[PDB]
């Protein structure tokens with residue numbers, strides 16, 4: 001599976017029939033239809049003890065991985081019941097600044113989208129959590145192109161060392177707090193992984209406020225390769241799934 005004409009999102013359902021399921025992601029967020037849910041509890045993003053370990057080009061994106069062997073970096077509150085542990089983050093981005101996000105907002109595409117992936121500790125490990133309807137919480141953050149995000153530059157600067165699929169590099173001491181916007185206002189809905197295996201195990205929490213990154217920062221994302229070393233170069237761009245049918249779901253807002 002990949003993002004090309006012959007193996008991209010329109011093909012995924014043949015190997016992964018849940019691609020046509022009842023709670024697939026991403027979705028378009030219609031901001032006028034989303035309803036404030038006065039009942040949602042405050043959201044709690046607690047990343048002070050986050051322990052990054054490694055960055056990996058997996059052929060689909062690059063993942064910054066964390067040590068999730070203890071409650072260090074956790075997401076709580078909001079729509080969530082219990083505690084969700086950060087395991088990795090990654091991005092989806094475009095070939096041009098006018099596309100790249102997975103979620104859209106009133107059909108607007110952002111230049112990229114950051115996914116901070118967390119698993120519900122009540123299920124013990126990530127592989128068990130993805131088999132549960134409430135196994136994961138993904139915090140999604142839009143990227144627009146404008147001012148540079150200083151907290152992103154350490155990620156940007158290591159990408160030269162993981163250009164191709166299967167390459168990894170040590171990436172300790174990276175603070176994901178530097179990737180968050182000021183506001184934690186969000187939309188939330190029940191959905192899925194946005195790549196195979198497309199499992200319907202995710203509570204999505206999508207922040208309303210984008211972060212700004214510079215054109216130079218995102219241009220370096222676009223120099224990565226989908227291919228492995230020594231193979232014909234295929235730039236890693238447009239690694240996003242388009243919006244999927246909302247079906248029987250409501251998107252809730254944390255704000256008025």
Ligand SMILES: O=C1NC(=O)[C@@H](c2ccccc2)O1
Nearest residue numbers: 115117138192193194195196
């Ligand atoms: O929202 C998602 N972005 C992805 O790449 C996908 C996902 C796949 C596998 C593990 C964790 C997340 O689901």
Ligand SMILES: [Zn+2]
Nearest residue numbers: 090092115194
């Ligand atoms: Zn993702």
